[PDB]
Design an enzyme around this catalytic site. Structure first.
Site, PDB file in Angstrom:
ATOM      1  N   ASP A  35       0.819  -1.203   0.000  1.00  0.00           N
ATOM      2  CA  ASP A  35       0.000   0.000   0.000  1.00  0.00           C
ATOM      3  C   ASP A  35       0.857   1.258   0.000  1.00  0.00           C
ATOM      4  OD1 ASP A  35      -1.962   1.900   0.314  1.00  0.00           O
ATOM      5  OD2 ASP A  35      -2.407   1.432   2.420  1.00  0.00           O
ATOM      6  N   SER A 199      -0.707  15.463 -12.172  1.00  0.00           N
ATOM      7  CA  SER A 199      -0.967  15.067 -13.545  1.00  0.00           C
ATOM      8  C   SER A 199      -1.205  16.307 -14.391  1.00  0.00           C
ATOM      9  CB  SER A 199      -2.161  14.116 -13.597  1.00  0.00           C
ATOM     10  OG  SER A 199      -2.580  13.887 -14.919  1.00  0.00           O
TER      11      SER A 199
END
Length: 330
Positions: A35, A199
């Site tokens: 994770d 992004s």
């Protein structure tokens, strides 16, 4: 040193991935959920409330000759999906894919929430976010990657998740045969303890690319892709009959649909998520309403590039002094 381990979907939907981890002496092998959005290595154990164990493999520190109680230390964590777990702490030898750390904090669960109990395939979590998020008290502990870092050939690990298929976690090297083209690296902020990056935009299907900054985290422990409501609405508007259902808890679409791809930007590069990756199947057995793999982050407080996005890429988690993230197509 290096390590290399295969990671395997827990079910036919890729709801999560498990990776075998050796703990203790002799080795006890547990299947952990790696994770990159948390920083605790915790396991089902011989200490876990018996009624909260249902099929998991447990760690028994009393059977490990290298296990030592970390006296006074406790831990307690809550995840974004509302699940939680807590307990005390041992140090022990932990190996992943041939890579061994001695003195790793292994957090032994005394209590786990129902979500964990109900998932017999996940024996614990192995956190790979920054150690500043580790919950051990009063002495915060380091992640497996942080402990291994100095021994690694290169201070990196990579995630190569499969679509309906196994993939790979590598430590200490970049497998240049595992991706196509070049890796595009992008800046990381560690201010929230995550692999947080920006992004450069998105496209829906064969549509034109929208240049827009989307701050989010690269999180292998989250199943879906969670993006701003504007982006998600634009995606599902291209699927006839798709709608957001408050009763189901997100966007659903007719199971008869063909889903468009979704592209996200990494600098000037582009990662394409095929439409099939965005199908998470019927909302209930036999239903003709299917659950979408792109969902709104509104009310999470952060955008999450979860497995839906990451499995479309070869992803480098660069833990150099100034950390960065790298993405390649594959």
């Amino acid at each position: 040193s290096t390590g290399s381990a295969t990671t395997t979907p827990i079910d036919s939907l890729d709801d999560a991935y498990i990776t075998p981890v050796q703990i203790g002496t002799p080795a006890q092998t547990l299947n952990l959920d790696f994770d990159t959005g948390s920083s605790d290595l915790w396991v089902f154990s011989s200490e876990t409330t018996a009624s909260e164990v249902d099929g998991q493999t447990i760690y028994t520190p009393s059977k490990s000759t290298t296990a030592k109680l970390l006296s006074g230390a406790t831990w307690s964590i809550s995840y974004g999906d509302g699940s939680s777990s807590s307990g005390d702490v041992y140090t022990d030898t932990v190996s992943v894919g041939g890579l061994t750390v001695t003195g790793q904090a292994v957090e032994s669960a005394k209590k786990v929430s129902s979500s964990f109990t109900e998932d017999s395939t996940i024996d614990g979590l192995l956190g790979l976010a920054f150690s500043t998020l580790n919950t051990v008290s009063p002495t915060q502990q380091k992640t497996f990657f942080d402990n291994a870092k100095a021994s690694l050939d290169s201070p990196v690990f990579t995630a190569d998740l499969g679509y309906h298929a196994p993939g790979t976690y590598n430590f200490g090297f970049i497998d240049t045969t595992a991706y196509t083209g070049s890796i595009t690296y992008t800046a990381v902020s560690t201010k929230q303890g995550f692999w947080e990056w920006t992004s450069t935009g998105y496209a829906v299907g064969s549509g034109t690319f929208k240049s827009t900054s989307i701050d989010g985290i690269a999180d292998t422990g989250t199943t879906l892709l969670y993006l701003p409501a504007t982006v998600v609405s634009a995606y599902w508007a291209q699927v006839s009959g798709a709608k957001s259902s408050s009763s189901v808890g997100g966007y659903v679409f007719p199971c008869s649909a063909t889903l468009p791809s979704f592209t996200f930007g990494v600098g000037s590069a582009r990662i394409v998520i095929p439409g099939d990756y965005i199908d998470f199947g019927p909302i209930s057995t036999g239903s003709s309403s299917c659950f979408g793999g792109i969902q709104s982050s509104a009310g999470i407080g952060i955008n999450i590039f979860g497995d839906v996005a990451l499995k479309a890429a070869f992803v480098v988690f660069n833990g150099a002094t100034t950390p960065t993230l790298g993405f390649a197509s594959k």
